[PDB]
Amino acid sequence: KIEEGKLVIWINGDKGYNGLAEVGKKFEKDTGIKVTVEHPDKLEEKFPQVAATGDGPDIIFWAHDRFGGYAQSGLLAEITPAAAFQDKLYPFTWDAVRYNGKLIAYPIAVEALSLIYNKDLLPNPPKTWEEIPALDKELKAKGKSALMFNLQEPYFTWPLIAADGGYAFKYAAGKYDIKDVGVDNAGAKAGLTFLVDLIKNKHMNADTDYSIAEAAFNKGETAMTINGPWAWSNIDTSAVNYGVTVLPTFKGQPSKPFVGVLSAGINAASPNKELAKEFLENYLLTDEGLEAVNKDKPLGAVALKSYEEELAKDPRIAATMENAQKGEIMPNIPQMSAFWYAVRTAVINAASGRQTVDAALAAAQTNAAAMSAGLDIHFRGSRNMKEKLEDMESVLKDLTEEKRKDVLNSLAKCLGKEDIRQDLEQRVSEVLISGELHMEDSDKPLLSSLFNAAGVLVEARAKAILDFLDALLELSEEQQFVAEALEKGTLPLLKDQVKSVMEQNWDELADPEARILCALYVVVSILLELAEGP
Ligand SMILES: OC[C@H]1O[C@H](O[C@H]2[C@H](O)[C@@H](O)[C@@H](O)O[C@@H]2CO)[C@H](O)[C@@H](O)[C@@H]1O
């Protein structure tokens, strides 16, 4: 449980949490209610883990792209602010927090990555990505890097990947199409290829992360970085005389950052909903409140019309909003987790060399499609699921490699084919009762694999296979993408990413989103154990 008569608030540690704590102090000074502001690591992952059980903070701050998924998991109070209040904020900021017609969070501010550059080492920043290698040659001689930004998070590399035609989910005639993922197209490949070539020609280093890139820019070691408004506070504190401007173009097309809208959601399990509503509407989303947070670390273009009039003078905000216009506001749908986890890994592996660009992206397309279908819960019709999978894996490890390969054959054939799966289930069931094989079993290598070398049925094996087929039934379109992952040998990636998207730790096996993902995880896990070997 969460303590009544208090507010706990989680916000990311790159944002202005101290400023927010100031707004919480003022809230205490008026209403007598303590406000604790914490900033956990892996906040976006920690919240759904914790909040699934009925625990966590009262208010959660993150960009709006995570909030649909939280809403689908029943983790968020509906927010219902008065029309009087709604008019005080920019309409498009309310759109970003509107999921399936209901509002699921208060918008706070618009964030967009811009090119930040050291005016002392680079008076005129490049208008194109294509210039940057030459410019790094020139600067490397002087003892400086042209460009350093965080390659570990795809938020930062996505503007390049999207530039020549990458997209997450196609948006055509008012609707996103979950089935149409744009990670593996000519455009995305071009953009990612450029980034890898940058790394291959020692213009950037693949292990560069947020910390490294920030320190390098703030200590004068590098001429350009890519970051968002929150970063400007530490650049100010340092010596550097910096500009904020448009991102460079790629193939003569603008970089398209995914724009986020920092948002505050109320935990559905909080006993303090009215208190939290009051804090957000009357203390934070006021000129005094936002100023407190913005002075700590800049929010970007705030959602409160009145305080944005003050910040719109700043040329760094005009730059932020130029890039915002050139990019796209992120979708808030549940499938965004799937997209981001697929792309996080494609980019890391392509940069490191663990995978070619073409293969890294082909895998991301497949895994995103699979997880996106799994997260789509609509229009579908005695033991822990953790232990069950442990039992199943145990049994299929005792098999020989030929037998493993033969089981895999039959199960592969079921993927996407409800008739074949139904048949195999009937067969495995009869065999389990009868104890013996019939003539029609003679062309199912799986049924033979249920029998040990003595010609006796191993009941455990038949039961394991039945469990697999039950899990398989729970799945829908995701089956065809599990099949792709198996063919292309990228199951280990799918497995890993499925586990991230569950958010809850696999102890989730002690909600339809959870049923489908549990099943998806079991199917991927079993197919992998068969294809790879324990
Ligand atoms: O890297 C993918 C990640 O990107 C976005 O996260 C941003 C966030 O928008 C900003 O508020 C800031 O903290 O930088 C983050 C990058 O680490 C998405 O909001 C997030 O869901 C996604 O995983």
Q: Is 111 in the pocket of ligand 1 (CB under 6 A)?
A: yes
Query: Distance, CA 332 to ligand 1 centroid (Å)?
Result: 13
Q: Is 508 in the pocket of ligand 1 (CB under 6 A)?
A: no
Q: Which atom of ligand 1 is nearest to the CA of 15?
A: 13
Q: Is 63 in the pocket of ligand 1 (CB under 6 A)?
A: yes
Distance between CA atoms of 386 and 72, rounded to whole angstroms?
23
Among the residues of 149-286, which ranges form H helices?
A: 154-163, 186-200, 210-218, 232-237, 273-279
Query: Distance, CA 264 to ligand 1 centroid (Å)?
Result: 15
Q: Is 340 in the pocket of ligand 1 (CB under 6 A)?
A: yes
Integer angstrom CA distances of residue 426 from 54, 247, 412, 522: 41, 59, 17, 21
172's CB contacts (< 8 A; 6+ apart) are none
Gaps after which residues in the chain, C–N over 2.5 Å?
A: 381, 510
Distance between CA atoms of 112 and 301, rounded to whole angstroms?
9
Q: Which atom of ligand 1 is nearest to the CA of 210?
A: 17
Atom 16 of ligand 1: nearest residue by CA position: 155
Query: Distance, CA 357 to ligand 1 centroid (Å)?
Result: 22
Place of tokens 């809403």: 71
Distance between CA atoms of 71 and 332, rounded to whole angstroms?
10
Output the six-digit token pair for 315: 């040329």
Residue type at position 243: G
Tell me phi and psi for residue 50, to 5 degrees: -75, -45
User: How many Cα atoms sit within 13 Å of 217 on the Cβ side?
Assistant: 33
Q: Is 157 in the pocket of ligand 1 (CB under 6 A)?
A: no
Resolution in A: 2.8
Atom 2 of ligand 1: nearest residue by CA position: 155
Handedness of CA 184, 187, 191, 193 (dihedral sign): positive
Q: Is 260 in the pocket of ligand 1 (CB under 6 A)?
A: yes
Atom 6 of ligand 1: nearest residue by CA position: 155
Query: Distance, CA 29 to ligand 1 centroid (Å)?
Result: 33
Place of tokens 């498009």: 92
Ligand 1: residue of 11, 153, 297 to mutate (most ligand atoms within 8 A of CB) is 153
Distance between CA atoms of 41 and 259, rounded to whole angstroms?
22
Q: Which atom of ligand 1 is nearest to the CA of 62?
A: 11
Tell me the three-class secondary structure of 412-457, residue by residue: HHHCCCHHHHHHHHHHHHHHHHHCCCCHHHHHCHHHHHCECCCCCE
Query: Distance, CA 155 to ligand 1 centroid (Å)?
Result: 6
C-alpha angle 53-54-55 in degrees, rounded to nearest 5:
95
Domains and their CATH numbers in the chain? 6-111+259-329 (3.40.190.10), 118-256+334-372 (3.40.190.10), 382-475+504-532 (no CATH)
Q: Is 65 in the pocket of ligand 1 (CB under 6 A)?
A: yes
Handedness of CA 356, 357, 358, 359 (dihedral sign): positive
Atom 14 of ligand 1: nearest residue by CA position: 155
Q: Is 158 in the pocket of ligand 1 (CB under 6 A)?
A: no
Q: Is 155 in the pocket of ligand 1 (CB under 6 A)?
A: yes
What is the CA 235 to chain-centroid distance, rounded?
Answer: 28
Query: Distance, CA 141 to ligand 1 centroid (Å)?
Result: 34
Tell me the three-class secondary structure of 262-273, residue by residue: EEEEEECCCCCH
Tell me the three-class secondary structure of 33-72, residue by residue: CEEEEECCCCHHHHHHHHHHCCCCCCEEEEEHHHHHHHHH
**Experimental technique of record:** X-ray
Are 217 and 225 spatial neighbours (Cβ–Cβ below 8 Å)?
yes
Pairing type for strands 328-329 and 258-266 reads parallel
Other CB atoms within 10 Å distance of the CB of residue 460: 15
Are 525 and 386 spatial neighbours (Cβ–Cβ below 8 Å)?
no
Q: Is 153 in the pocket of ligand 1 (CB under 6 A)?
A: yes
- Contacts within 8 Å (CB) and 24+ apart, 281-290: 281/81, 281/85, 281/106, 283/23, 283/26, 283/27, 284/20, 284/23, 284/106, 284/108, 285/88, 285/89, 285/106, 285/108, 288/23, 288/26, 289/23, 289/26, 290/108, 290/109
Q: Which atom of ligand 1 is nearest to the CA of 12?
A: 13
Closest CA to 148 of 122, 124, 123, 176: 122
